[PDB]
Design a protein around this ligand. Structure first.
Ligand SMILES: Nc1ncnc2c1ncn2[C@@H]1O[C@H](COP(=O)(O)OP(=O)(O)OP(=O)(O)O)[C@@H](O)[C@H]1O
Ligand SMILES: Nc1ncnc2c1ncn2[C@@H]1O[C@H](COP(=O)(O)OP(=O)(O)OP(=O)(O)O)[C@@H](O)[C@H]1O
Ligand SMILES: Nc1ncnc2c1ncn2[C@@H]1O[C@H](COP(=O)(O)OP(=O)(O)O)[C@@H](O)[C@H]1O
Ligand SMILES: [Mg+2]
Ligand SMILES: [Mg+2]
Ligand SMILES: [Mg+2]
Lengths: 487, 365, 166, 50, 523, 46
């Protein structure tokens, strides 16, 4: 029973997306892939993945396509191994699905090798220490929660706070000039968003159809059944692993949304005979996510810079899925709806974000000191806000109002217009250098810009843009005064 | 015609609470069929069952309308040849009935011309009315903020001891007595004394002329009744109103108190039927049961039925599935709040949470 | 001549001659839109010539459909067609398209739309066919003689409490 | 019924070698006519209450 | 030469609106998610859908019609095909069930199709005018978009969608049928009377010619309520795949989930959160992914979705509400407090969003919307934290946003333009609606003989398409518009506002109050 | 503070009860769906 290739079985039960298969010669190994060879008048092929063994002959499986027109006793043939996906530079510039089949209608892909989507995570001895700052061109991220090359980044947020927008901005700022390759994994998200990304990448020449592309796309979306949404992330991760190990390249891995991987497994968990856990997720929530996350790491051979978007259901960060993902990250960016409702974008709550490289040993001393001072001032400003609410701004002392006035400028100065959100904002984006951000905030903290109007810091880039906006504000105010004077 | 299953003989196979399984050798009768237990069993009253499910080609699950005390296995049961039918017509006016249609006023026989089944199909789209007009109740809050519609559906959502019953009596006094058409009072899971008080009140007002023509019919299955009866008294009362609406083209008032007990009764039996409960613990078919019942309470092109239903909110939780699902089935919604009552304000209507459909300048001034 | 490519890089059929012939054989101009629909389905995007033919059919067609359609207007249909061409297809209307619009305005007696189209041709294109400009002015002065320069109910004097707000 | 059963048997290629047998069943749902079922092929030539 | 069906077994058990089947030994067997016919009589059949295939061979069936006729022991025939329903232009103006059966009033499309591929779509760039200034400006909707309508009971969720369908009637009559917008209104678990009232309402405005209704009333079994959205969108996919645009309204998905929960629990499916089945997200997800904007290569057709969702006490933390919000490209949140406060439609702009953005707005509306957005943002903050222009113009913007019927594009854009350029600064907030009514339904310049414009007058409805082409800030149209609004402001202030501010009599005061309230419900 | 504390302590009690009820309902559903097979034991030798 070593080689199960071509082994035959029959469908015994079909309930939703879960199908039970009976093999007379013994069920193949778990995670094995099976094809429904029977002609059932289907418009699409049917493939199953074994997830459990009910007995020595019966095996429970999840289908990757809809189980429509599936009859009992239908013949099934093993593929001799797990689900395999193509790898190599020949996949660049292409769009794939969970099964590794091109869906871009751009002709056959020349694949020299295929790898299984299920692989063992790197061990402790295969861990590399890479502490280098990643410049994303964003004031908030670069200052409070700087990102580390070869590390893991999470974008925790609700619905409509700007998770997808930030990912687009990161791609536009980090991927266009990236030395290595990029892999984008769409998981249980809107199909149109994938289409817009594909068009933008082609325009930005990341995907050069006539020339050489430098990115791969793997899409399993909402329309797909839960089986596909629970494995598309593994497929893309497998491609990135190959680029990391075989090609020895530094690769980017964008995932949106990682929560859908958990959600899909919860949907099928009920039909697998597993008692639901708290809230209603599957009991294997922590272990399943851990196996996937540990594979997303930088080893001694190569480096993977991972950016993952996490959906916090109903803005409840105490939910098991968002919480379980916090310990598997090197930099967490927590977005808040209240911030967005106030016109501040990106709607980052700096008091809830964290970074591993926020240590003087890794980053410059000035950078560390400035960030801590900003955080302390914001914390104090929030406490003073209660007093402003009850007593009023008048009753605050001289020192307190200076904190209030400076802190408000910090809150508005953290906002930044992105180059990808021009339609939303109607203004050109800005790319702020790391040094400019540190100097601008350092001067603001010590009061070098106390006389600048507050609104001059709203939706701008570096300090230079602040001065220009203040000058423009002064000019228009003078014109209004002149108009009033004539009246 | 005569049913092909009348006189069919079955034997009791399982008894659990108010749920009884019956095995028929020749085949289980159709669902909703009525069965009578023939064995004496030393009972003080007859035992009647209504089929609700089919376990197999021979076994059928049923709910008992009376208590299942002294009921043994293998007891003999006989099909009645049809669903539970109740009397209809002017003969029922001035009388009190139960779920089975038996008069409980200890007066002469009804002598009805015919009977009709409680379970019936609802009016279709083409048989719907398009008449909107204001029913003046004399109450300031209702007539102003949430005016009621003639021939429409009205609900009074409220907790315990908030004023639901009082408002109904006020509406009865101010409308039913001075009403040209007929009236039907359906008591469902409510105090038995209230029915007695209403009966005395209707006799004193001479809406029931024991020796003359009456304009009101009473149908009562109260708290003391088992869940089976409380889940069907509303159907029987509604059936009488349907006959007046259609067979006579007469305007009808339908005062139901309380409709929540109907859903509660179906929940109790559903637990025994072996069904997986929904949220809170209600039956999964909560919405469907209300839909079938409420859709029958409507005004067609033949006649009009103005319905006023009292809704009990358990634990003062307006988000409970029972009251929550009932909002979509009501033209007018009157929400009562306990805190308002504790402030000395009666009625305790919370106008912000109330609504009406005829609050349209095209209808009202 | 030169292969065209769509948004995603796939090629589009450019031989749009047969479709133009089909358009030039329609009786009611609503049927013309059906031809445009078929062209798009067949991945044969219309060119400037196709839109001009559609405008010609609208001007020369008796009515929108065999049966009358309430509030039907040839001018509205053509302007919407131009909006689709310029915005959702990125094609600049030429002189021919605007001339068809001006002819429709003159034919229909709508002399105020003619003034606006006249300026459009004088702004984007090079002037207006002086034959049509004169025809529009003749229609306008006919209204002045007959008094149909503006709807009459507008000229009726009103007041704060003399206006019926439906 | 026998003629219909034979015709159905002829149509079925799988049952070419099988021997035809007829089994009568009483259905109270049909007042007139008959129906024939063979290897899943069902032919209805019956009527019920109007 | 016989109409041989495929018998697969008998009916074993019946539990309400669902059933179970036992297969006869040695029979072909039935396929998953297929339609079957239960022979309730030698000539009458009841429709059912396959839902479960158990190890024992038993089959779970969702009944769709003639449930009362189903009894244990009856025969079952297998069609062997999925659900297909009639589709085409011949169904418009009719009321139908999810099965396609027409409901009397007083081509086959598959219901289980897949959504368009990633490369089969195109960016949303064509607007879909709801007719409401608030939505069209601050919450753009584009064809091929899914825009949720979430709110509490009795807040205008149904009215706004119906108005959106009605607003297309006038447009469709003028432009070619190519760009006409067809409507599929799907009523789920609603009262039968409400459907009839909606049918009459659509008929009055003549919207039935471009609209069809798919009704699954409360009295109907859960199966029909479960399939109604899929059948409705299928009728709308017929036009999408043929270079035409459609608008599908679901009223409402909240009751669909209940029906799906009812079916699953009765068929012995494990419950999940709030007793809903585990795969409740996937239900709506595959429903709304079928609404897209096809690429030029496939025709350019589209389907626009307006699913409706109900909350309890303005709680958007519920289960199904959250799932739908995470699927759609935007949400319109109708707030109870605003509704009772006199703001109608009660659109909460702060909680509402459209992820398509200005791309779903006409070139004419882009400039007005962009500047309007900044003013309101400042207005919200100024009051939250001195008669500034932002605060003067914001209050009048809110007053303009109140409506009862959809507004023609020309009338709406020109009123917003006026309030944007300060033409209403001298006008009191209470009189803004009266000012708008005179601007649209009257012409002060002609009344007082001071109109020197050549073409730009509000009574020339054909100007809507010229505006939509050139923009209101263009040399062709800018000058006459400014003069038209400059004469209108001067005449209005002089002849109307002066008298209005001089009213003290109780009779006159009451008369004015009636006028202004009527003007709210007129324009 | 005494009115919002009660609603907070009343909410936690309800939340614990409901979550536990959900889990047990799923447990009973998966127990009900399960069916015991024929017992393959030497019944005669009893
Ligand atoms: N309109 C009213 N005016 C004065 N007191 C009222 C009024 N309505 C109710 N009450 C008071 O509230 C009490 C309870 O009213 P009611 O009998 O209507 O309760 P209910 O809503 O039917 O509740 P339940 O039937 O569940 O006990 C009355 O006995 C009376 O004391
Ligand atoms: N823009 C509006 N202006 C004034 N009244 C409105 C407006 N929109 C709706 N209404 C009115 O508000 C009431 C509720 O409207 P609607 O039927 O749309 O609510 P809904 O969201 O469908 O609520 P439900 O269906 O749960 O009853 C109706 O009386 C309707 O006429
Ligand atoms: N940088 C930004 N500037 C302005 N609006 C933004 C920005 N980022 C996000 N938004 C708002 O959020 C919408 C996009 O939401 P999205 O990025 O998809 O969030 P998520 O995926 O977390 O729901 C935009 O349409 C806009 O309303
Ligand atoms: Mg997103
Ligand atoms: Mg009471
Ligand atoms: Mg509604």
């Amino acid at each position: 029973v070593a080689d199960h290739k071509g082994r035959v079985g029959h469908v015994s039960q079909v309930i939703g997306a879960v199908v039970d298969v009976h093999f007379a010669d013994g069920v193949p190994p778990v995670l094995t892939a099976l094809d429904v060879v029977d002609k059932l008048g289907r418009d699409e092929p049917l493939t199953l993945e074994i997830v459990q063994h009910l007995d020595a002959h019966t095996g429970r499986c999840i289908a990757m396509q809809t189980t429509d027109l599936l009859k009992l006793k239908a013949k099934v043939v093993s593929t001799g191994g797990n689900i395999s996906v193509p790898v190599g530079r020949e996949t660049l510039g292409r769009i794939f699905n969970v099964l590794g089949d091109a869906i871009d209608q751009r002709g056959p892909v020349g694949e020299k090798l295929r790898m299984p989507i299920h692989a063992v995570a790197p061990k402790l001895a295969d861990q590399a220490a890479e502490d280098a700052v990643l410049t994303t061109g964003i004031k908030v991220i670069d200052l409070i929660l700087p990102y580390c090359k070869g590390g893991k980044i999470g974008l925790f947020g609700g619905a409509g706070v700007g998770k997808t927008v930030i990912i687009m901005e990161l791609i536009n700022n980090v991927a266009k000039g990236h030395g290595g390759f990029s892999v984008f994994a769409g998981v249980g998200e809107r199909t149109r968003e994938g289409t817009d990304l594909y068009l933008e990448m082609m325009q930005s020449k990341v995907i050069d159809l006539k020339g050489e592309s430098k990115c791969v796309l793997v899409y399993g979306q909402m329309n797909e059944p839960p089986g596909a949404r629970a494995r598309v992330a593994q497929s893309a991760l497998t491609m990135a692993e190959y680029f990391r190990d075989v090609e020895g390249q530094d690769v980017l891995l964008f995932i949106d949304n990682i929560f859908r991987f958990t959600q899909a497994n919860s949907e099928v968990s009920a039909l697998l005979g597993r008692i639901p856990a708290a809230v209603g997720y599957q009991p294997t929530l922590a272990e399943d996510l851990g196996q996937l996350q540990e594979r997303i790491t930088s080893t001694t051979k190569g480096s993977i810079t991972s950016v993952q978007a996490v959906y916090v259901p109903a803005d409840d960060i105490t939910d098991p899925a968002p919480a379980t993902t916090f310990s598997h990250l090197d930099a967490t960016t927590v977005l808040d709806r209240a911030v967005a409702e106030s016109g501040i974008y990106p709607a980052v709550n700096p008091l809830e974000c964290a970074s591993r490289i926020m240590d003087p040993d890794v980053i410059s001393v000035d950078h560390y000191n400035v960030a801590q001072d900003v955080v302390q001032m914001l914390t104090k400003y929030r406490e003073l806000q209660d007093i402003i609410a009850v007593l009023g701004i008048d009753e605050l002392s001289e020192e307190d109002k200076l904190i209030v006035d400076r802190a408000r400028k910090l809150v508005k100065f953290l906002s930044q217009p992105f180059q990808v959100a021009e339609v939303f904002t109607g203004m050109t984006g800005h790319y702020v250098q790391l040094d400019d951000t540190i100097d601008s905030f350092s001067g603001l903290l010590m009061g070098t810009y106390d006389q600048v109007p507050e609104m001059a810091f709203y939706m701008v880039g570096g300090i230079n843009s602040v001065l220009e906006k203040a000058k423009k504000m002064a000019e228009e105010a003078a014109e209004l005064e002149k108009m009033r004077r004539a009246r | 015609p005569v049913a092909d299953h009348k006189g069919r003989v079955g034997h009791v196979s399982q008894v659990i609470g108010a749920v009884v399984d019956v095995h028929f050798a020749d085949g289980v009768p159709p669902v909703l069929t009525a069965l009578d237990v023939v064995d004496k069993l030393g009972r003080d009253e007859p035992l009647t069952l209504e089929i609700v499910q089919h376990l197999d080609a021979h076994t059928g699950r049923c709910i008992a309308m009376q208590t299942t005390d002294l009921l043994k296995l293998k007891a003999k049961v006989v099909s009645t040849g049809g669903n539970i039918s109740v009397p209809v017509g002017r003969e029922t006016l001035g009388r009190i009935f139960n779920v089975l249609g038996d008069a409980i006023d200890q007066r002469g026989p009804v002598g009805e011309k015919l009977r009709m089944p409680i379970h019936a199909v609802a009016p279709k789209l083409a048989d719907q009315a398009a008449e909107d007009a204001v029913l003046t109740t004399g109450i300031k809050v209702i007539d102003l903020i949430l005016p009621y519609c003639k021939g429409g559906k009205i609900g009074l959502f409220g907790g315990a001891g908030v004023g639901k019953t009082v408002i109904i009596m006020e509406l009865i006094n101010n409308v039913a007595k001075g009403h040209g058409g007929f009236s039907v009072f359906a008591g469902v899971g409510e105090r038995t004394r209230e029915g007695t008080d209403l009966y005395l009140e209707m006799m004193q007002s001479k809406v029931i002329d024991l020796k003359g023509e009456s304009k009101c019919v009473l149908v009562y299955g109260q708290m003391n009744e088992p869940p089976g009866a409380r889940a069907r008294v509303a159907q029987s009362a509604l059936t009488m109103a349907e006959y007046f609406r259609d067979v006579e083209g007469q305007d009808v008032l339908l005062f139901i108190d309380n409709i929540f007990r109907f859903t509660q009764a179906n929940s109790e039996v559903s637990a025994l039927l072996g069904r997986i409960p929904a949220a809170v613990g209600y039956q999964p078919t909560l919405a469907e049961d209300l839909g079938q019942l409420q859709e029958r309470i409507t005004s067609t092109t033949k006649g009009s039925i103005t319905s006023v239903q009292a809704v009990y909110v358990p634990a003062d939780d307006i988000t409970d599935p029972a009251p929550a699902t009932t909002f979509s089935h009501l033209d007018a919604t009157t929400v009562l709040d306990r805190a308002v009552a504790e402030s000395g304000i009666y009625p305790a209507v919370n106008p912000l949470e109330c609504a009406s459909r005829i609050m349209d300048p095209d209808v009202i001034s | 001549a030169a292969k065209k490519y769509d948004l995603f890089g796939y090629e589009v059929d450019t031989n749009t001659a047969p479709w133009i012939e089909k358009i030039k054989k329609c009786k009611y101009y609503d049927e013309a839109g059906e031809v445009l629909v078929n062209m798009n389905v067949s991945n044969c995007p219309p060119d400037i010539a196709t839109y001009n033919a559609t405008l010609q059919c609208i001007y020369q067609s008796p009515s929108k459909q065999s049966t009358p359609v309430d509030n039907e207007s040839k001018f509205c249909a053509m302007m919407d067609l131009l909006e689709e061409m310029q915005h959702r297809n990125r094609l600049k209307p030429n002189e021919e398209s605007w001339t068809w619009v001006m002819k429709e305005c003159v034919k229909s007696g709508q002399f105020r739309l003619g003034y606006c189209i006249q300026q459009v041709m004088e702004t984007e294109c090079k002037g207006c066919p002086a034959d049509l400009v004169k025809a529009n002015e003749a229609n306008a002065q006919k209204a002045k003689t007959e008094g149909k320069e503006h709807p009459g109910h507008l000229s009726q004097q009103a007041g704060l409490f003399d206006v019926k707000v439906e | 019924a026998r003629r219909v059963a034979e015709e159905l048997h002829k149509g079925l290629k799988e049952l070419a070698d099988y021997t035809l047998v007829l089994k009568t069943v009483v259905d109270r749902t049909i007042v007139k006519g008959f129906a024939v079922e063979l290897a899943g092929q069902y032919v209805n030539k019956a009527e019920g209450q109007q | 030469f016989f109409k041989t069906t495929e018998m697969i077994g008998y009916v074993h058990s019946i539990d309400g609106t669902i059933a179970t089947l036992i297969p006869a030994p040695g029979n072909p067997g039935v396929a998953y998610n297929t339609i079957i016919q239960i022979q309730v009589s030698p000539t009458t059949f009841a429709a059912g859908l396959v839902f479960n295939l158990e190890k024992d061979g038993r089959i779970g069936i969702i009944l769709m019609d003639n449930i009362t006729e189903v009894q244990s022991g009856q025969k079952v025939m297998a069609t062997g095909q999925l659900l297909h329903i009639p589709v085409g232009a011949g169904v418009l103006g009719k009321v139908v069930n999810p099965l396609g059966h027409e409901v009397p009033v007083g081509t086959l499309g598959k219901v289980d199709t897949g959504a368009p591929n990633i490369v089969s779509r195109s960016p949303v760039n064509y607007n879909l005018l709801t007719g409401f200034k608030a939505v069209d400006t601050m919450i753009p909707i584009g064809r091929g978009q899914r825009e949720l309508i979430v709110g509490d009971r009795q807040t205008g969720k149904t009215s706004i969608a119906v108005s959106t369908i009605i607003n297309q009637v006038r447009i469709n009559q003028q432009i070619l049928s190519k760009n006409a917008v067809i409507s599929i209104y799907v009523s789920i678990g609603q009262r039968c009377s409400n459907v009839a009232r909606i049918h009459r309402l659509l008929q009055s405005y003549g919207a039935l010619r471009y609209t069809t209704v798919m009704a699954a009333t409360a009295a109907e079994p859960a199966g029909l309520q479960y399939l109604a959205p899929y059948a409705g969108v299928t009728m709308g996919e017929y036009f999408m795949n043929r270079g035409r645009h459609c608008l599908c309204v679901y009223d409402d998905l909240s009751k669909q989930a209940v029906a799906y929960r009812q079916i699953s629990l009765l068929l012995r499916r494990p419950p999940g959160r709030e007793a809903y089945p585990g795969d409740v997200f996937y239900l709506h997800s595959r429903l709304l992914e079928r609404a897209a904007m096809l690429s030029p290569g496939k025709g350019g057709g589209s389907v626009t979705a307006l699913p409706i969702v109900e909350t309890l006490s303005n709680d958007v933390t519920a289960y199904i509400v959250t799932n739908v919000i995470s699927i759609t490209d935007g949400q319109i949140y109708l707030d109870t407090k605003l509704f009772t406060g006199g703001q109608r439609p009660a659109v909460n702009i702060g909680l509402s969003v459209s992820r398509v953005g200005s791309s779903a707005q006409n070139a004419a509306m882009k400039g007005v919307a962009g500047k309007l957005k900044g003013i309101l943002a400042e207005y919200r903050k100024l009051a939250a934290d001195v008669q500034t222009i932002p605060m003067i113009r914001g209050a009048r913007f809110v007053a303009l946003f109140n409506q009862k019927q959809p507004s023609y594009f020309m009338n709406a854009i020109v009123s917003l333009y006026a309030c944007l350029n300060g033409y209403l600064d001298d006008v009191k907030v209470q009189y803004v609606k009266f000012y708008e009514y005179l601007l649209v339904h009257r012409d002060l310049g002609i009344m007082y003989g001071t109109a020197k414009n050549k073409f730009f007058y509000m009574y020339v409805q054909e100007l809507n398409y010229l505006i939509r082409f050139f923009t209101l800030n263009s040399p062709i149209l800018h000058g006459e518009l400014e003069e038209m609004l400059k004469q209108h402001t001067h005449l209005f202030l002089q002849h109307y506002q002066s008298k209005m501010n001089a009213i003290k009599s109780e009779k006159d005061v009451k008369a004015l109050k009636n006028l202004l309230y009527s003007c709210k419900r007129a324009v | 503070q005494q009115r919002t504390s009660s609603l907070y302590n009343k909410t936690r009690q309800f939340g614990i009860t409901a979550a536990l009820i959900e889990i047990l309902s799923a447990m009973s559903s998966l127990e009900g769906n399960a069916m015991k097979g024929v017992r393959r034991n030497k019944f005669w030798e009893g």
